[PDB]
Write a protein that binds this ligand. Structure first.
Ligand SMILES: Cc1cc2nc3c(=O)[nH]c(=O)nc-3n(C[C@H](O)[C@H](O)[C@H](O)COP(=O)(O)OP(=O)(O)OC[C@H]3O[C@@H](n4cnc5c(N)ncnc54)[C@H](O)[C@@H]3O)c2cc1C
Ligand SMILES: Cc1cc2nc3c(=O)[nH]c(=O)nc-3n(C[C@H](O)[C@H](O)[C@H](O)COP(=O)(O)OP(=O)(O)OC[C@H]3O[C@@H](n4cnc5c(N)ncnc54)[C@H](O)[C@@H]3O)c2cc1C
Ligand SMILES: C/C(NCc1cnc(C)nc1N)=C(/S)CCOP(=O)([O-])OP(=O)([O-])O
Ligand SMILES: C/C(NCc1cnc(C)nc1N)=C(/S)CCOP(=O)([O-])OP(=O)([O-])O
Ligand SMILES: C/C(NCc1cnc(C)nc1N)=C(/S)CCOP(=O)([O-])OP(=O)([O-])O
Ligand SMILES: COc1cc(OC)nc(Sc2cccc(Cl)c2C(=O)O)n1
Ligand SMILES: COc1cc(OC)nc(Sc2cccc(Cl)c2C(=O)O)n1
Ligand SMILES: [Mg+2]
Ligand SMILES: [Mg+2]
Ligand SMILES: [Mg+2]
Lengths: 585, 585, 290
């Protein structure tokens, strides 16, 4: 039984109704940046003794923090901004949350109702602007609609395929006195009728049957499996089917497990991509057949019977046609199949040892590899050391680029929601704020932002947030003085012709620029730089052992390339396995 | 006769066609941040020997720089970004340019045409998203359309009421070989038929007539007058009518001129607001009757015959009904009226001395004022010193908040395009990047970003851009450790209850946080802090005399309020003239 | 009710629109493509592996054959009155099922679908998804222009027919051999049926005649035809029906046959909205018992 700070018959501001509506959703943390159009909301927030506000230094930091909060916990992330420039500063986060299917509720203040459409002070039609980059949005036009809409917003954001929901709230609505009705029924009759049903025994028996008849099966696991860690593991134990994971699916099946093919795709491993290429049964669980994974669709799993289980009916048959499909929660599908697989275990005689040995050969002939040049630090090695010293238990957030891929390749994630990274939109500057949200959602955890120098500086202002909020956020900055991934493509496809990818100062070309240590010092965050590989192990340990926030500037040679690589729209035969940005002797 | 780097019969990439299309528009500077979807464009940019790219550290910095470039020169500002997260990072700038009517052309890369709508890697429907916050936008669907669309984009951005135009360019279009036709005719038959005609003698004679019959006329001048500096001055000489200016219109009529009422509106002067209140003739030139100026519309110029000259037919009669209206270029209207006013000069006998004396009394009884507390620095005084030491010749860009208003109140702008500030959208973090664009457009000028500590830190990453590009950008940072303007409203309307407006560290409460000097040091930019008013004059001089970029951290007491103030939706009788955030003894 | 539809069947869905697969019901097996090509591929396999497959569904067919004999389509004949079902059945016989049929929307549309044996596709032209009245007569026009040597018959209701009655002018002027088999029940029949079943036969603006002259057929559709120089006739008694339809068919060019039917007729069987197979209605009409 919820306890209000108001009498049930007592009028209160719409702003107070809004905040209590959040309290009744179990919300404990918001990321709100004040402005004139949302002042009433912020006033109401201070009256709450259960909701903590983490004030960012930029609303993009605010929404990315909400994402990190969400991704690291499975809870909805809540960000609040003012009208106009506040609202427009959320846009990248909204689009990011939609593409990566992250449960998120964004609240924006709006000009008074009567002034909407008049090009008023700090007015943007944010509902119009964000309609195509949110799961759903609202423009509250009456104070009485606030409880219902907030309930619907959280329901839509967290149910089915999770996503961002924006609620636009006019200032006069926030100010209006009213008595809220919390027993209002939601008006989503369409959405709820099309909610996926629990999987029939019929469908699951067919899949189990296909498994018994296959000789080269491969699991194709993605971000839809984040809540199915135990079920998937039980499934793998019963079937003995090797597991290939997407960038979004990392951790669902532990990376350092015997049956793990690690990541597939453009920068996926040779053996993972090999497995899918030569499979005769593809179990696509919680994936969306992205071009970054498939390459040329006609060549992707060309000789495999494809089973696709997705909670979104719109995703089934979108890019590739499955032989067998199940529209529902993959968690429930796995449970049903595990039940069948265990009863008919001796009847089924499942053994894919021959297939596993075939893949095991590829894993030993073409493993992940990096080269060490003199005393220079391999970025791959640095991440591998972080793994060892954190015992693979750290929550990792990243920016976007080479460092992001290396973070995905050379860290063994033992559970999902250890890996927080922008995949679909691939938005730089995501790393640092996401770490903030992750740390608030997981106060007793090791949180490390593995960032690139380009990505890090975009939202560098959030270092202020980290110090002020006293968050134990560790920044492992892999500094190659370049926009690394764009640089790599320049090397491969444009004859190494640099087009605005160098991030240092051309005047002082051999100096590391900017001095990221001084950014940290500006915000009272202890920091250090490491250049020689010998000093690296002790440096990372110092970062970890030093209480509170810490920045480690890891200097890396920029010529490093992410490998292997299947070029855009390519096939497995097009895979690149060797080479970097260095010229031969 | 333009010179191409290609034979007229030679096929070239769409990316090269695009860049040459820019060259043919006279473009010399772009603000482009590379990404996979725009790499071809960036490659093409390096082949240009006439277009300089200023690489920002954030696309929001990129578009704001383009704005500063535009606002300070009257030329269109050009920013380029990649697909997805690049494009969405432009959104605040686009909305800003639309509301402030700034000529701007934004180019974004897009996923290949065939992949549009498939939720591809780094795909946002940016055209859909930005339709309501741009003057117009395009999605290029054929390489042959590139020359025509670019011509249309620049034409639309710079003609009529200036604004932002976005051109979305799919990657495969950039790669496709083609032979461009530069003689293509534009397809804007609707837009061009509704382009305002030159003002008839009929309309102008009527206005001149009203002037001769009025006894209390007031000029109401705004951002539509930025190109009419000489004409307006000639007009004032002939009529002797006092001039009230909007935030956007500063500089159009010189502030330190005898007939200047300075700024009107919410934080306008008492005498400027008085003049409009008691006027019997209101000459609204290049204004849009904003709520921030008018307050309660029914009370605004309630006893005045209103003349409105605007280049947008949609703006006439929108919020207030004019007695006389002219839809056209105010520059041409002024010329026509000046011609009439000079011929019929002795016939007209214009003399408003009585009205001027009446206003002159108000100007002496209720002038702009600030208080000096001990050795502390009044932010108002600091800006007044910058005026003196730059002889009012500096180009000023600001963030948004109290410092913005003080920059508007206590600096005497002698020409338009000295004042670069976000007015309609009021977007924080605008100051520093705008200064960058202004400095590139005006290399031999004094460029000073008068910023607040909240606004400054939002795009602090652009300090890297400033050092790398070696721009003589001066930052006059007025540091009150607060979100000042929100703080002021808290003091006035919420009993000084702080709701997330303090920007320092609560643990070390009396320390200035963050240390902005170290941000500057991180980017190799010389910097200093000044706290005592005695040291202020020499400090600002040092900033000015030191070659290249410079940061001056000016520490101000946070209790300062912007005065005077007409509360939201209020009238002239509601004006607040005294008080701050300090408690009495 | 979707959950009850083919509840115990493995569902195979072949559709050329990827958006339609799994939209309302989840298939066990799906193929996105031209069903024409799918059939060709399967036919090839089915013929080669024919003796290997041993296909025989005689038991299933007999089970269904029992249902077909216990619950066939049925209509009742009242005195000398014309059953609309019977009229359509006679048109079938006299055209040898070779006619192109267009219809309006309503009861007559269903009876046209139930009691005419279509031998080929594109013989049946009817608004299904939108179900737009007034479709019949103009569709017949287009059909006749596209098929000049064919028998084209618009089986129309009196409500649907009058909506675009102006196109009779088009038919005469263009000299199109369009036959109109107008099943006239003086009502918006299908809405009337739902009134009988679900609203206690309470008439809410479904009668299309003139309440003043209640027993007169209104309007006089023959005069609409005469206005456009189209030969026409009315038939009321079932005995005269066979010769009347033949006359319509044998008379060169456009022709209107006003077939007067008792309005109490119901389309059967009927599964109510959102219902299941157990909810099927097999008997009853708009008449009260003795
Ligand atoms: C620089 C860069 C490089 C990249 N390269 C690669 C690469 O090499 N390999 C790679 O894999 N990715 C790569 N990506 C990421 C890629 O763009 C996509 O983000 C990713 O491939 C798609 O993730 P996903 O297929 O697992 O589906 P997601 O995007 O994670 O979406 C989840 C899917 O599962 C469904 N689902 C959600 N919840 C449930 C549920 N409870 N039950 C059932 N289904 C559910 C959803 O409907 C959705 O279809 C890269 C990204 C970047 C920025
Ligand atoms: C914190 C804050 C406080 C503010 N308080 C104030 C205040 O106290 N006082 C104030 O004035 N503003 C204030 N504003 C700014 C305010 O929101 C608006 O930006 C401003 O009042 C409107 O400017 P404008 O009326 O001159 O028209 P603009 O926004 O500058 O638009 C120009 C108008 O002139 C027309 N026009 C353009 N070109 C031509 C041409 N060639 N010929 C003819 N017409 C043309 C356009 O169609 C348009 O209608 C504040 C902003 C902020 C961020
Ligand atoms: C510019 C770019 N991509 C285009 C781009 C632009 N802007 C945004 C917001 N996001 C993206 N992804 C990349 S991956 C390079 C980032 O470089 P980095 O952050 O220093 O990381 P790294 O050098 O390891 O590749
Ligand atoms: C938060 C806010 N307005 C809400 C807001 C939020 N986010 C953006 C991008 N823009 C605005 N205008 C203001 S004016 C306070 C800014 O404080 P400051 O930059 O330090 O300047 P000052 O303290 O002089 O008022
Ligand atoms: C009103 C109606 N449906 C609503 C309706 C309204 N308007 C149009 C254009 N189409 C439809 N389907 C029907 S089925 C009754 C039509 O009666 P009819 O044309 O005389 O045919 P019948 O009496 O056999 O049912
Ligand atoms: C925090 O300082 C400021 C300043 C200001 O005008 C400069 N308005 C606001 S609030 C606002 C915001 C948008 C629209 C509107 Cl109509 C309002 C309003 O209620 O007046 N707050
Ligand atoms: C700079 O590094 C990267 C990486 C990458 O995939 C990780 N793609 C690109 S380019 C791109 C961008 C969007 C869509 C598409 Cl289809 C593409 C593409 O052409 O493949 N560039
Ligand atoms: Mg880098
Ligand atoms: Mg401040
Ligand atoms: Mg009828």
């Amino acid at each position: 039984t919820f306890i209000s700070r108001f009498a049930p018959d007592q009028p209160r501001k719409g702003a107070d109704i809004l905040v209590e509506a959040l309290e009744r959703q179990g919300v404990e943390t918001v990321f709100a940046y004040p402005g004139g159009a949302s002042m009433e909301i912020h006033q109401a927030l201070t009256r709450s003794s259960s909701i903590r506000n983490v004030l960012p230094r930029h609303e993009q930091g605010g929404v990315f923090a909400a994402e990190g909060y969400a991704r690291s916990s499975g809870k909805p992330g809540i960000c609040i901004a003012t009208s106009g420039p506040g609202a427009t500063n959320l846009v990248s986060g909204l689009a990011d949350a939609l593409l990566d299917s992250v449960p998120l509720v964004a609240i924006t203040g709006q000009v008074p109702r009567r002034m909407i459409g008049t090009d008023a002070f700090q007015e943007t039609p944010i509902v119009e602007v964000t309609r195509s980059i949110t799961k759903h949005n609202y423009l509250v036009m009456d104070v009485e609609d606030i409880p219902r809409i907030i309930e619907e917003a959280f329901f839509l954001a967290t149910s089915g395929r999770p996503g961002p929901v924006l609620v636009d709230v006019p200032k006069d609505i926030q100010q209006q006195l009213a008595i809220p009705n919390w027993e209002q029924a939601m008006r989503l009759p369409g959405y709820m009728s099309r909610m996926p049903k629990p999987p029939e025994d019929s469908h699951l028996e067919q899949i189990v049957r296909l498994i018994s008849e296959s000789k080269k099966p491969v699991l194709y696991v993605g971000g839809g499996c984040l809540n199915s860690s135990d079920e998937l593991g039980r499934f793998v134990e019963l079937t003995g089917i090797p597991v290939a994971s997407t960038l979004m699916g990392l951790g669902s099946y532990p990376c350092d497990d015997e049956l793990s093919l690690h990541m597939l795709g453009m920068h996926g491993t040779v053996y993972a991509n090999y497995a899918v290429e030569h499979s005769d049964l593809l179990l696509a669980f919680g994936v969306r057949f992205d071009d970054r994974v498939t390459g040329k669709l006609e060549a992707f799993a060309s000789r495999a019977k494809i089973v696709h289980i997705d909670i979104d009916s719109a995703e089934i048959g979108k890019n590739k046609t499955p032989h067998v499909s199940v529209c529902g929660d993959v968690k429930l599908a796995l449970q049903g199949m595990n039940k069948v697989l265990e009863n008919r275990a001796e009847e089924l005689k499942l053994d894919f040892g021959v297939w596993r040995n075939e893949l095991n050969v590829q894993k030993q002939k073409f493993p992940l590899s990096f080269k060490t040049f003199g005393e220079a630090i391999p970025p791959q090695y640095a991440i591998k050391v972080l793994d060892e010293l954190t015992d693979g238990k750290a929550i990792i957030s990243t920016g976007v680029g080479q460092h992001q891929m290396w973070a995905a390749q050379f860290y063994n994630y033992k559970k999902p929601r250890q890996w927080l990274s922008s995949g679909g939109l691939g938005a730089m500057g995501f790393g640092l704020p996401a770490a903030i949200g992750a740390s608030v959602a997981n106060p007793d955890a090791i949180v490390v932002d593995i960032d690139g120098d380009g990505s890090f500086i975009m939202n560098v202002q959030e270092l202020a947030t980290i110090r002020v909020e006293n968050l134990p956020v560790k920044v492992l900055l892999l500094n190659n003085q370049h926009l690394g991934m764009v640089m790599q493509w320049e090397d491969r496809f444009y004859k190494a012709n640099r087009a605005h990818t160098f991030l240092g100062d051309p005047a002082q070309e051999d100096e590391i620029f900017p001095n990221m240590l001084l950014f940290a010092a500006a915000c009272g965050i202890p920091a250090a730089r490491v250049t020689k590989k010998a000093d690296l192990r002790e440096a990372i340990q110092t970062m970890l052992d030093t209480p509170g926030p810490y920045l480690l500037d890891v200097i890396c040679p920029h010529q490093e390339h992410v490998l292997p690589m299947i070029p855009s729209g390519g096939t497995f035969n097009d895979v690149i396995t060797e080479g970097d940005g260095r010229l031969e002797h």
